[model samples]
Target: GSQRRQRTHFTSQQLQELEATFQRNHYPDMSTREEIAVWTNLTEARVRVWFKNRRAKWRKREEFIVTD
Candidate 1:
Protein backbone atom coordinates (compact mmCIF):
# COMPACT_ATOMS: atom_id res chain seq x y z
CA GLY A 1 0.00 0.00 0.00
CA SER A 2 1.10 3.57 -0.62
CA GLN A 3 1.56 6.22 2.04
CA ARG A 4 -1.57 8.22 2.68
CA ARG A 5 -1.78 11.69 1.23
CA GLN A 6 -2.27 14.52 3.68
CA ARG A 7 -5.86 14.23 4.80
CA THR A 8 -7.60 17.12 3.16
CA HIS A 9 -10.81 18.18 4.83
CA PHE A 10 -13.52 18.59 2.26
CA THR A 11 -15.44 21.79 1.69
CA SER A 12 -19.14 22.10 2.51
CA GLN A 13 -20.22 21.28 -1.04
CA GLN A 14 -18.05 18.19 -1.07
CA LEU A 15 -19.37 17.14 2.30
CA GLN A 16 -22.91 17.64 1.11
CA GLU A 17 -22.22 15.41 -1.88
CA LEU A 18 -21.01 12.63 0.39
CA GLU A 19 -23.93 12.98 2.77
CA ALA A 20 -26.45 13.11 -0.04
CA THR A 21 -24.97 10.06 -1.75
CA PHE A 22 -24.82 8.16 1.51
CA GLN A 23 -28.41 9.01 2.29
CA ARG A 24 -29.49 7.99 -1.17
CA ASN A 25 -27.96 4.49 -1.08
CA HIS A 26 -27.30 3.64 2.51
CA TYR A 27 -29.16 0.33 2.55
CA PRO A 28 -29.03 -3.31 3.60
CA ASP A 29 -26.75 -4.62 0.89
CA MET A 30 -24.28 -1.85 0.11
CA SER A 31 -21.21 -0.82 2.06
CA THR A 32 -21.00 2.87 2.94
CA ARG A 33 -17.36 3.18 1.84
CA GLU A 34 -18.06 1.61 -1.53
CA GLU A 35 -21.06 3.80 -2.16
CA ILE A 36 -19.17 6.92 -1.19
CA ALA A 37 -16.13 5.98 -3.27
CA VAL A 38 -18.28 5.30 -6.31
CA TRP A 39 -20.33 8.41 -5.88
CA THR A 40 -17.32 10.65 -5.35
CA ASN A 41 -15.04 8.85 -7.80
CA LEU A 42 -12.52 8.35 -5.03
CA THR A 43 -10.73 5.28 -3.76
CA GLU A 44 -12.31 3.32 -0.94
CA ALA A 45 -9.48 4.28 1.37
CA ARG A 46 -10.09 7.95 0.66
CA VAL A 47 -13.79 7.46 1.20
CA ARG A 48 -13.11 5.78 4.51
CA VAL A 49 -10.88 8.64 5.54
CA TRP A 50 -13.59 11.12 4.61
CA PHE A 51 -16.12 9.23 6.69
CA LYS A 52 -13.74 9.13 9.62
CA ASN A 53 -13.23 12.87 9.42
CA ARG A 54 -16.91 13.50 8.82
CA ARG A 55 -17.79 11.58 11.98
CA ALA A 56 -15.40 13.73 13.94
CA LYS A 57 -16.80 16.87 12.36
CA TRP A 58 -20.32 15.76 13.21
CA ARG A 59 -19.32 15.35 16.83
CA LYS A 60 -17.94 18.86 16.87
CA ARG A 61 -20.99 20.17 15.06
CA GLU A 62 -23.21 18.55 17.66
CA GLU A 63 -21.31 20.41 20.35
CA PHE A 64 -21.79 23.83 18.76
CA ILE A 65 -25.17 23.19 17.15
CA VAL A 66 -27.21 23.70 20.26
CA THR A 67 -25.17 26.55 21.59
CA ASP A 68 -26.54 30.09 21.65
Candidate 2:
Protein backbone atom coordinates (compact mmCIF):
# COMPACT_ATOMS: atom_id res chain seq x y z
CA GLY A 1 0.00 0.00 0.00
CA SER A 2 2.88 2.30 0.62
CA GLN A 3 3.76 2.18 -3.05
CA ARG A 4 0.22 3.04 -4.10
CA ARG A 5 -0.31 6.08 -6.29
CA GLN A 6 -3.24 8.43 -6.25
CA ARG A 7 -6.42 6.95 -7.69
CA THR A 8 -7.94 8.35 -10.85
CA HIS A 9 -11.60 7.98 -11.70
CA PHE A 10 -12.67 6.88 -15.16
CA THR A 11 -16.18 7.47 -16.44
CA SER A 12 -18.44 4.48 -17.11
CA GLN A 13 -18.37 5.14 -20.87
CA GLN A 14 -14.59 5.33 -20.84
CA LEU A 15 -14.43 2.02 -18.98
CA GLN A 16 -16.79 0.38 -21.45
CA GLU A 17 -14.62 1.62 -24.29
CA LEU A 18 -11.42 0.41 -22.62
CA GLU A 19 -12.86 -3.06 -21.98
CA ALA A 20 -14.05 -3.28 -25.56
CA THR A 21 -10.62 -2.34 -26.82
CA PHE A 22 -8.97 -4.79 -24.44
CA GLN A 23 -11.11 -7.67 -25.60
CA ARG A 24 -10.47 -6.76 -29.22
CA ASN A 25 -6.72 -7.13 -28.59
CA HIS A 26 -7.00 -10.86 -27.78
CA TYR A 27 -6.24 -11.54 -31.42
CA PRO A 28 -2.68 -11.69 -32.61
CA ASP A 29 -1.09 -8.73 -34.38
CA MET A 30 -3.34 -6.36 -32.55
CA SER A 31 -2.68 -2.61 -32.74
CA THR A 32 0.25 -1.11 -30.89
CA ARG A 33 0.46 1.53 -28.19
CA GLU A 34 0.55 4.33 -30.73
CA GLU A 35 -2.68 3.19 -32.29
CA ILE A 36 -4.56 2.80 -29.02
CA ALA A 37 -3.15 6.01 -27.60
CA VAL A 38 -4.06 7.92 -30.71
CA TRP A 39 -7.53 6.46 -30.80
CA THR A 40 -8.15 7.04 -27.06
CA ASN A 41 -6.17 10.28 -26.89
CA LEU A 42 -4.35 8.85 -23.88
CA THR A 43 -0.61 8.58 -23.36
CA GLU A 44 1.24 5.34 -24.19
CA ALA A 45 2.09 4.87 -20.53
CA ARG A 46 -1.56 5.23 -19.59
CA VAL A 47 -2.55 2.59 -22.11
CA ARG A 48 0.10 0.25 -20.79
CA VAL A 49 -1.01 0.83 -17.23
CA TRP A 50 -4.62 0.25 -18.15
CA PHE A 51 -3.76 -3.07 -19.77
CA LYS A 52 -1.79 -4.14 -16.73
CA ASN A 53 -4.68 -3.43 -14.40
CA ARG A 54 -7.09 -4.97 -16.85
CA ARG A 55 -5.10 -8.20 -16.94
CA ALA A 56 -4.99 -8.38 -13.17
CA LYS A 57 -8.72 -7.77 -12.95
CA TRP A 58 -9.39 -10.42 -15.54
CA ARG A 59 -7.36 -12.92 -13.59
CA LYS A 60 -9.42 -12.25 -10.49
CA ARG A 61 -12.63 -12.57 -12.46
CA GLU A 62 -11.49 -15.88 -13.91
CA GLU A 63 -10.78 -17.19 -10.45
CA PHE A 64 -14.17 -16.03 -9.26
CA ILE A 65 -15.88 -17.72 -12.15
CA VAL A 66 -14.03 -20.95 -11.52
CA THR A 67 -15.00 -20.99 -7.87
CA ASP A 68 -18.53 -19.66 -8.08
Candidate 3:
Protein backbone atom coordinates (compact mmCIF):
# COMPACT_ATOMS: atom_id res chain seq x y z
CA GLY A 1 0.00 0.00 0.00
CA SER A 2 1.03 3.59 -0.46
CA GLN A 3 2.15 5.76 2.41
CA ARG A 4 -0.45 7.82 4.21
CA ARG A 5 -0.87 11.38 3.03
CA GLN A 6 0.49 14.09 5.31
CA ARG A 7 -2.56 16.29 5.25
CA THR A 8 -2.12 20.03 5.63
CA HIS A 9 -4.77 22.71 5.68
CA PHE A 10 -4.80 26.25 4.34
CA THR A 11 -7.21 29.15 4.61
CA SER A 12 -9.84 30.14 2.05
CA GLN A 13 -7.67 33.12 1.24
CA GLN A 14 -4.76 30.83 0.48
CA LEU A 15 -6.92 28.67 -1.78
CA GLN A 16 -8.18 31.73 -3.67
CA GLU A 17 -4.65 32.85 -4.23
CA LEU A 18 -3.79 29.45 -5.61
CA GLU A 19 -6.83 29.41 -7.88
CA ALA A 20 -6.08 32.86 -9.22
CA THR A 21 -2.48 32.00 -9.97
CA PHE A 22 -3.41 28.75 -11.69
CA GLN A 23 -6.18 30.30 -13.77
CA ARG A 24 -3.61 32.69 -15.17
CA ASN A 25 -0.81 30.17 -15.67
CA HIS A 26 -1.29 26.49 -16.20
CA TYR A 27 2.28 25.56 -15.36
CA PRO A 28 4.12 28.10 -13.32
CA ASP A 29 7.90 27.88 -13.39
CA MET A 30 10.03 27.19 -10.28
CA SER A 31 10.29 30.84 -9.28
CA THR A 32 6.52 31.22 -9.48
CA ARG A 33 6.02 28.19 -7.25
CA GLU A 34 8.51 29.58 -4.78
CA GLU A 35 6.73 32.90 -4.73
CA ILE A 36 3.34 31.22 -4.38
CA ALA A 37 4.70 29.15 -1.51
CA VAL A 38 5.74 32.33 0.25
CA TRP A 39 2.40 34.03 -0.25
CA THR A 40 0.40 30.96 0.73
CA ASN A 41 2.73 30.11 3.62
CA LEU A 42 2.91 26.58 2.25
CA THR A 43 6.05 24.77 1.26
CA GLU A 44 7.29 24.84 -2.30
CA ALA A 45 6.63 21.10 -2.37
CA ARG A 46 2.99 21.60 -1.43
CA VAL A 47 2.64 24.46 -3.89
CA ARG A 48 3.95 22.22 -6.64
CA VAL A 49 1.68 19.44 -5.45
CA TRP A 50 -1.35 21.76 -5.60
CA PHE A 51 -0.49 22.74 -9.12
CA LYS A 52 -0.11 19.08 -10.07
CA ASN A 53 -3.52 18.18 -8.67
CA ARG A 54 -5.10 21.33 -10.14
CA ARG A 55 -3.76 20.55 -13.60
CA ALA A 56 -5.71 17.31 -13.67
CA LYS A 57 -8.89 19.22 -12.95
CA TRP A 58 -7.97 21.80 -15.57
CA ARG A 59 -7.76 19.07 -18.21
CA LYS A 60 -11.27 17.86 -17.43
CA ARG A 61 -12.56 21.42 -17.35
CA GLU A 62 -11.07 22.02 -20.79
CA GLU A 63 -13.28 19.28 -22.19
CA PHE A 64 -16.39 20.69 -20.55
CA ILE A 65 -15.47 24.14 -21.76
CA VAL A 66 -14.94 22.94 -25.31
CA THR A 67 -18.62 22.55 -26.06
CA ASP A 68 -18.34 25.13 -28.78
Write down the TM-score of every candidate.
Answer: 0.50, 0.60, 0.66
Give RMSD (Å) of candidate 1 vs. truth.
5.7
Lowest lDDT 10-residue stretch of candidate 1: 21-30
The candidate maximizing TM-score is 3
lDDT of 3 at 10: 57
- Which stretches of model 3 miss by more than 4 angstroms? 1-8, 63-68
Candidate 3, residues 3-60, lDDT tens digits: the string is 3554455566778888887776768877888887885777777778888887788787
Q: Compared with the true structure, what per-residue lDDT tens digits does model 2 show for residues 1-68? A: 34244436444555666677766674212247557666664566766777778778888787234355
* Predictions in order: lDDT: 0.59, 0.61, 0.75
The pairs that clash in candidate 1 are none
lDDT of 3: 0.75
Best by lDDT: 3
TM-score of 3: 0.66
